[PDB]
Amino acid sequence: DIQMTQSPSSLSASVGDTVTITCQARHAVGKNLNWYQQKPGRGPQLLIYMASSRHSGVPSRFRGSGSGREFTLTINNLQPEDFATYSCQQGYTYPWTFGQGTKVEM
Amino acid sequence: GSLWVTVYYGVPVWRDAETTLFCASDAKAYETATHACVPTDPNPQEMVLENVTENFNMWKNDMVDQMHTDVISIWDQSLKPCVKLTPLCVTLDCSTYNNTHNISKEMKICSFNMTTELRDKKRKVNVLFYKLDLVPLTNYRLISCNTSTITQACPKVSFDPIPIHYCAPAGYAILKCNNKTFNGTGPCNNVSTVQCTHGIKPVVSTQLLLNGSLAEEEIIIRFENLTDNVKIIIVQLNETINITCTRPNNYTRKSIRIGPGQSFYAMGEIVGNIREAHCNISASKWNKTLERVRTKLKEHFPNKTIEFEPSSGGDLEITTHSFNCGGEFFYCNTSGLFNSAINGTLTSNVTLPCRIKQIINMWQRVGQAMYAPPIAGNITCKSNITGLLLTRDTFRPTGGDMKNNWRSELYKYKVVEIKPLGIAPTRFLGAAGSTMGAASMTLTVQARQLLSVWGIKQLQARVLAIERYLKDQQLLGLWGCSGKLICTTNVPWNASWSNKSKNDIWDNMTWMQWDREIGNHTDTIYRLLEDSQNQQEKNEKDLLCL
Amino acid sequence: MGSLWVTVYYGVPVWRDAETTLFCASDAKAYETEKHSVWATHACVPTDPNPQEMVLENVTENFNMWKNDMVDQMHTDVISIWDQSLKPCVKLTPLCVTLDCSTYNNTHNISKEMKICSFNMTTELRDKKRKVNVLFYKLDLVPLTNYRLISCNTSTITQACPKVSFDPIPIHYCAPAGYAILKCNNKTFNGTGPCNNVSTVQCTHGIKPVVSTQLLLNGSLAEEEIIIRFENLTDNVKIIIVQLNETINITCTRPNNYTRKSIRIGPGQSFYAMGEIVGNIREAHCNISASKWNKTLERVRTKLKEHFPNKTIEFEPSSGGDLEITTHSFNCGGEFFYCNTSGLFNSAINGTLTSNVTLPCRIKQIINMWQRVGQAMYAPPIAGNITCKSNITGLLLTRDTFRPTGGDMKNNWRSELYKYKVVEIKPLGIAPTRCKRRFLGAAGSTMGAASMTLTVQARQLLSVWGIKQLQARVLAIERYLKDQQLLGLWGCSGKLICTTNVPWNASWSNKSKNDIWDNMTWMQWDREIGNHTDTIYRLLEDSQNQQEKNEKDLLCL
Amino acid sequence: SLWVTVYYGVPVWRDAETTLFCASVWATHACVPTDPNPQEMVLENVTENFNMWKNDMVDQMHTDVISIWDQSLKPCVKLTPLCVTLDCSTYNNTHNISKEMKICSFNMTTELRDKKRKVNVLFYKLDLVPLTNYRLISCNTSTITQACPKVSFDPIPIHYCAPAGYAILKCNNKTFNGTGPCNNVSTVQCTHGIKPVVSTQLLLNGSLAEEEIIIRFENLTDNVKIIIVQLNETINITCTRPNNYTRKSIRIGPGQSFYAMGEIVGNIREAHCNISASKWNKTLERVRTKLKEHFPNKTIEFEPSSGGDLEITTHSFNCGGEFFYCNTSGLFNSAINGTLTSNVTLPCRIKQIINMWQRVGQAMYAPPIAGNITCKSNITGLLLTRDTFRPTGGDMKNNWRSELYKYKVVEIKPLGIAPTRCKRAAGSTMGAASMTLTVQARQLLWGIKQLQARVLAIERYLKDQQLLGLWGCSGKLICTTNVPWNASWSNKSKNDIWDNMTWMQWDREIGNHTDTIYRLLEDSQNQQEKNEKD
Amino acid sequence: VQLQESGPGLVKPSETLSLTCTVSGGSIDDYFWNWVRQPPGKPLECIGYIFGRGGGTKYNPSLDNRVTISTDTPNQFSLKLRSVTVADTAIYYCARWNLYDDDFGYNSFAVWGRGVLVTV
Ligand SMILES: *[C@@H]1O[C@H](CO)[C@@H](O[C@@H]2O[C@H](CO)[C@@H](O[C@@H]3O[C@H](CO[C@H]4O[C@H](CO)[C@@H](O)[C@H](O)[C@@H]4O)[C@@H](O)[C@H](O[C@H]4O[C@H](CO)[C@@H](O)[C@H](O)[C@@H]4O)[C@@H]3O)[C@H](O)[C@H]2NC(C)=O)[C@H](O)[C@H]1NC(C)=O
Ligand SMILES: *[C@@H]1O[C@H](CO)[C@@H](O[C@@H]2O[C@H](CO)[C@@H](O[C@@H]3O[C@H](CO)[C@@H](O)[C@H](O)[C@@H]3O)[C@H](O)[C@H]2NC(C)=O)[C@H](O)[C@H]1NC(C)=O
Ligand SMILES: *[C@@H]1O[C@H](CO)[C@@H](O[C@@H]2O[C@H](CO)[C@@H](O)[C@H](O)[C@H]2NC(C)=O)[C@H](O)[C@H]1NC(C)=O
Ligand SMILES: *[C@@H]1O[C@H](CO)[C@@H](O)[C@H](O)[C@H]1NC(C)=O
Ligand SMILES: *[C@@H]1O[C@H](CO)[C@@H](O)[C@H](O)[C@H]1NC(C)=O
Ligand SMILES: *[C@@H]1O[C@H](CO)[C@@H](O)[C@H](O)[C@H]1NC(C)=O
Ligand SMILES: *[C@@H]1O[C@H](CO)[C@@H](O)[C@H](O)[C@H]1NC(C)=O
After folding, report:
1. DSSP states of B519-531 as a string?
2. How far apart are CA C256 and CA D309, in angstroms?
3. E78: domain range?
4. What is the spatial distance between Cα D191 and Cα D403, in angstroms, rounded to a whole number?
């Protein structure tokens, strides 16, 4: 099964963060990544569906980008609802593993 | 007086830029990288620059991304006219394969029913598939019919590579670097402008580069990141190793019709006794080369005991060596080569068994795939091992990333956008490192290059070059220096922009050095020259009618 | 004082009422790029940082908004983008099958607009065929108890991609270089005939491509008075367009909430239908303020008395026709509403109104756009309740008592673009000059003034959708180099005022200097000299090569 | 000392390889509407060698016509579902039984997919290939496509318009080898409208050498190639579809219709395409005399059709919306021998399914028109081959060549070097052509074909302007240069170089030195510009 | 569409586990139905995924020979796990992979349920 990593493991700032991620295993999975946001003690929901562009409902602040192993998600002009976890995901094989969970606070 | 403003059209200047790029296949019609690619020019011209140093990032190259997109475009244009085997998706009863000469573990005959070209009745069709592609449900189904659909390759066209010579559009140049010892990243000491890259074979391989470029002096290894395990490591070997692969048996070919005008190729019964498909390498050469590789890893990555272990695990395309031999894809388990302590006698060739796969899901995309046709009769291949791909963990082989395959050959080249518009104070690309006073001799040679669906792509690039020339001419007309290299007098140079003395500017620096020195302020002087040309034009209008 | 000698002028304000290709300029911001739109590409260039307009003086041009070029170009472009947006989406090939339908019975009550239909259908696995039950509107379903889809006669159905949206995105129709759009500042102008003062724009305000029948939605507002636009007062077949003085807030809704059910047809392909409806069924209401509507309709009556005098006038509901024509058909919030507009124009009302006028509406999955056969879309059911607040800003009427009229999607584009006209700057002019060799600011102004302001025109002249932008670009390049090389063959390339070594001719004209340079305009001047341009061009380049060869021979000792 | 000068706008021309944009099924409206009247000038003291059998225009025209054919057939209905088993039996009209067609019942889907129903259609026996079960010929290899009704099979005159900087030269001369030098040649920007007609063995509406029968020869040593005979006078060929058909429209599927041939009405005969007998006699005497003169002491005698595949053995042509194939054996037969007093007819047969350009699978199903149609045309040509001369055809490239042999392309290198002592019109002389440069220069100044022509002309113009400005002559038509002339290049006389020499030969003499002089011009102005800077 | 989990608040070690997820908004679509367990401060992990109503199921060899996905009623789809271990204690969730290209959200857990914590 694929192993997964994220960096920084737990960030802390308000506005302008950038969640780079290295997902190892077989690199350049393609555009087959999915980000998520999990509110504290709540169900996660989609943010980006192909590391390409925003999902319906989630604003233009949240975006995903990058091909190769260097997939990334950028959040700009964060509001108080933005602070939560975000994880890497694959799309190639049935067990889709997640990142450890990059946390943003303050 | 003091040094005052002067334009210089066509002097050697480059910014690290990204632009569009087009193929140019070989001129000979023997291969006639499809045929719509333009034939290459007879002479790929190369000119070495003196005193010029450029920082090549092997991993932040734009042309690898453009190469990936363009070769995806080639592949999809090839596949689109071909047949789509959507009706092939049926429930499939299957049974093992027992040839009249021996039995096969790798195979199974499966019997299934479809519709004829006549739209009512068909008959039982018994055709042969590997265990790797079919998936049980003892009834089986193809690997990815639900999530995706399978597009048959056109039987005429072959998947073998043809050398593609990417060429810079007009106003843009490709910069190879001629330092022999080089690791891809960082400065390279002396460079060469090249009209087109050397013919790159669109070769598909994993853990062992095939038919690639040779290290000229010694085995050289490149790093994407020393301190992190994710980033990949390239090995480019000096000399070579013959890899010799075979298809031992004779597989029949059976053309089965799907509907009116559509037919797909299956195998049918094998002839001859089944033998395991395999590929071997000379043992002594492999041992020598791998010892050199381990020694090099010790040299650069210091103090650590470095060991080679087989690939960990995954789908069969991940752990093994994928390659297109004779128009058919196999996957060769590399448990022999990279595993140490097997204690080879070194007289026999080291042998790797291989599994041949029918359905190829490559390019790291879901939703689209191929049913590779079964080639008839034996196939033999004899190719090079010109590079390896590993990672830090021990050092272990990896694969699956074609971007790295394209990285390996294009590690030398970088695109540069020539901006002719050089603004300086004042009282082909070979003279870049030379002085400005000397480099102004050769500005005409760089000026010459500014002029000299893929048809639509190269037309768009040509139009980009045309409107670039007309942007230069438009700006010089808005400045009134149009049609000439050097203008008149009386426009002052503000001191705040730069502080160098009159004499040392020309001899000391390069045009690129002056560009970096003058880079930020350029818009301000473009305004001041613009308005200057306007107010002078008003005065000249007062002169026009007397 | 001497004999008149020729002079060429590059950049004098001149035009011909021409035809040309116009290229889109989609809205710049990124959320609308994310909200993928059928009408607007992302490849469409961003709008200008400053949508610019300049106003001319002492110029009067004839505008025929019925026979204008924006209308044809927008109709073709919008059909092209429609087909492009529908092309990747699945073609619902195994839909056109027999269906067993019965009226839908919700757990609360029965619905008039709905029937549950069960039918057999072949999926991505061709062997597997099984019953599939889905809801269907009565209007879209044509009988043979067995029903089928209405458009199985016309074409195989194509699903709208839920990714792409039908929402109108403002399109800044913008013209290539060498062409300028001419607006009319006169608010009261009927759109046909001369306009007394006009404006030149590099491009137009953002026009919303909005499909609407019998009424105009989100349209432009007459700033001074309610206005009537008429192709022919005498002929009844023509169409009457009311541009409304003030908006009339229309509030539309579908009260129920809809559940989307997906059925697989292909690998990665499904057909979206509505499931059971949640909540008690209630009709779709599109209600409008009644005092406002009455006051406005009566203002229409008062303004309309002038253009057809001394006759009693009564607005009457449309007699009959296809549902797109008789009923107000429009899309808001991603669903198609068809609203019986009878009550708005009904003569039953005697001028007494106190509360909102209500109009029932019906919604259709299957729509044929632009009245073409060969095309038919499947609208996926939007989930939840939609409540769209729109402005009624214009009416479509026709004389036999004036009835509402619909179905002419061309007229919706006419109604917004009544003021804009394409004009092709032909910058070349010829005239005698005092100094004699051996945007659009100065159109109506004096000739010498234009001679001074030539520089602005020159500066502006200097500078299939991807193919359309490329076509615009290369047209600009070809026109620019055409003019420049003609000037080179005339002897003054790069010079705007090309004094010439050629005498004028009495045959071309006998006008005095003061006449041409004080009173005659560049358009009048082109009318005078427009019959002799070719000959002067050829003999001027002849004169240049003669002079140059004479100078070369004299140079040779 | 002689110094370097460059004249811009000079007439010179190598055998160029450009692309010519179409002009207006055959004349698509996307192709630009042709300018109604092509113009034509005349030259003095010019001869141009045209290889009729290697010219690029035959392949360009072939590619254009196939592309237009596929463009027309693509939006129209794809007859994919038609390939089904068909039960068939002979067609018995009230008049008589016809061998040409027969009735075929087959099941077909209603527009709703659930149910199928039986449909009866009359198919030509020629198109119906056996498997009473039969199938369609071109359903074997790929899918057939039905043409649209609105599009017209009539050959709309296509005029080959050249791109800017390129002009077409037409060998106007009456008599000609079909190859080699031509006496006086017209110059056109666009050609006369070539009607694209599917021709085999004979021609319809072709161009006419009104003065004399002419012979064109791919090889005068090898037999396998084909010999063209351009006939003299117009031979009227007149044809009628013998009987009246009925159009039965069947809805094969949702939104797709299928026009089928129903029953027949009227007198059932074969299509009878006969000509004037006296014209045939006189023309045959003339060609026999001419080919006897061309082949001295070797006898000439024609032969009936050789036989083989139905496309090559027969005269073939489109008229009235139908495609005809007529056995030309009896017309060329020496055994008939009987009479030449009245119009004799060779019977023709119609195929609904056409594998055109000899591609397997890519085929067109004829719209079956309901009712008789007359079609009258002129014959002005003939296809034979050296071997008792058996005719041959099927080479549509050769059909294009027959009308396309007259024309040739020429580019203009406007810049041209000729030394001159002074310091810093094709038949006429270089000094005489200085005045005529401007008219040249102005001429220098499917949709994507128009785009290609536009951009290629634009690039060539900016290369001329570029190189001129690299020689200090941008925007100027005649340029003196400060650089001297290296005497080693050429050894011509001072008075002969602007009076005597023909321009073509001069270009041939200086071509080997052109690149060197250009490279030495650029450094000349570069050094002069730095000299002026100081 | 709204998605919700249902299960026991506490499980004992070495005892069978079951869970049930409810799609309240509509009937069970043809989309991919998924369970995505979140261990305490560790990456989330797939269990068994089913392509709709009574479709084929892909389970995980990482949790080998214990998983099973089956459906009972058009609004319920359930997970069953046998031979649980102490390491399995976590917050479970149910979610939905959008197999199809044109829907907003593709090959992605679009709508997840709120989730349920199991102690084991
Ligand atoms: C004439 O002009 C009026 C006024 O503009 C139009 O009415 C407006 O229509 C727009 C477009 O519908 C409304 O704007 C947006 O609608 C979204 C509807 O939700 C989603 O619906 C489906 C559900 O699956 C999705 O597929 C689809 O993508 C839609 O997004 C709202 O979601 C938007 O608001 C939400 O997002 C933004 C993002 O930042 C937030 O700021 C909001 O608070 C909210 O969360 C948005 O509302 C618009 O609201 C309508 N009214 C008004 C007053 O502006 C008419 O349709 C138009 N044309 C005609 C013919 O009348
Ligand atoms: C791709 O999709 C097909 C259907 O489109 C899947 O086949 C289906 O597999 C399920 C297994 O969950 C079958 O359901 C059950 O299995 C057996 C065999 O029928 C039986 O015990 C039950 O009656 C029940 O049906 C389902 O019938 C079967 N459908 C068909 C038409 O064969 C297939 O598994 C999917 N492929 C994957 C996930 O790789
Ligand atoms: C060949 O010239 C003829 C001259 O008539 C052209 O038109 C024909 O006209 C008749 C009516 O008298 C049409 O119905 C025929 O179909 C036309 N064809 C022929 C061969 O006579 C015609 O455009 C020209 N060529 C062809 C191939 O039709
Ligand atoms: C690897 O990248 C990291 C940051 O991701 C950096 O700190 C480190 O220096 C890099 N090491 C290399 C390129 O050897
Ligand atoms: C604008 O249009 C109005 C129409 O009433 C007119 O009075 C005015 O002159 C026009 N121009 C400007 C600059 O306002
Ligand atoms: C009706 O659907 C809408 C759409 O969001 C929603 O507000 C409402 O909760 C749904 N149903 C009920 C029963 O409230
Ligand atoms: C035309 O040219 C041919 C050779 O091409 C020559 O034999 C013949 O005399 C010329 N005919 C006329 C009428 O000038």
Report:
1. STTHHHHHHHHHH
2. 69
3. 3-115
4. 11
Q: D316: Cβ below 6 Å to ligand 3?
A: no
Tell which CATH classification among 3.40.50.1220, 3.40.50.1400, 3.30.420.10, 2.60.40.10 matches the domain A1-94: 2.60.40.10
| Residue C381 Cα to ligand 6 middle (Å) | 15
Backbone angles phi, psi at A21, to 5 degrees: -150, 140
Q: How many separate helices (H) and strands (E) can be counted in chain D?
A: 7, 24
* Structure-token pair, residue D345: 């007819």
DSSP state string for D290-359: HHHHHSTT----B------STTTSSEEEEETTEEEEE--HHHH-SS-----SS--EEEEEE-SEE-GGG-
Q: Strands (DSSP E) along D149-304, which ranges? A: 166-171, 185-188, 214-217, 227-240, 244-253, 256-265, 271-274
Contacts of D166 (CB under 8 A, 6+ apart): D16, D18, D20, D409, D410, D411, D412
Question: Which of B77, B70, B46, B29 minimizes the C-alpha distance to B164?
Answer: B70
Structural tokens at position B374? 């079964």
**Three-state secondary-structure class, residue D467:** helix
Residue D459 corresponds to which tokens in the numbers above?
């690039």
The residues in B 122-181 lying below 8 A from D, measured between CB atoms, are none
Q: Which residues pair with B438 in a beta bridge?
A: none
Reference D226, options D61, D390, D54; nearest CA is D390
Containing domain of residue C261, as a range? Answer: 16-88+166-422
Any idea which ligand is nearest the CA of A57? 1
Kindly tell me the burial class for residue B100, based on how many C-beta atoms sit within 10 Å of its own C-beta (0-12, 13-18, 19 or more): exposed
Residues 259-298 of B with CB under 8 A from D: 260-261
Neighbours of D128 (CB within 10 A): 19
Q: Give the pairing type, strands D363-365 and D353-354.
A: antiparallel
Candidates E100, E107, E111, partner chain C, best to mutate (most C CBs within 10 A): E100
- β-strands B262-266, B270-271 pairing: unpaired
Please give, rounded to a whole number of angstroms, the shortest distance from the CA of D431 to a CA of chain C. 9
Reading the block at residue C86, the tokens are 């529908």
Residue D259 domain-assigned (yes or no): yes
Number of domains making up chain E = 1
Contacts with D452 from chain B: Cβ below 8 Å? 455, 459
List the CATH number of the domain containing E55: 2.60.40.10
For residue C276, what is the nearest residue in chain E, using CA coordinates? E26
Question: Domain ends where: D353, D386, D408?
Answer: D408
Structure tokens at D443: 């001429």
What phi and psi values does residue D63 have, to the nearest 5 degrees? Answer: -65, -45
The answer to whether D174 touches D211, Cβ cutoff 8 Å, is yes
Instruction: List CB contacts (< 8 A) between D107 and chain B.
Output: 120
Q: Is residue E9 part of a domain?
A: yes
Q: How many residues does chain D have?
A: 534
Distance CA C330, CA C208 (A): 13
Sign of CA dihedral A83, A89, A91, A94: negative
Q: What's the CA-to-centroid distance between D277 and ligand 3, angstroms?
A: 22
Residues B390, B235 contacting (CB under 8 angstroms):
yes
Assess A60–C contact: CB distance below 8 Å, yes or no.
Answer: yes
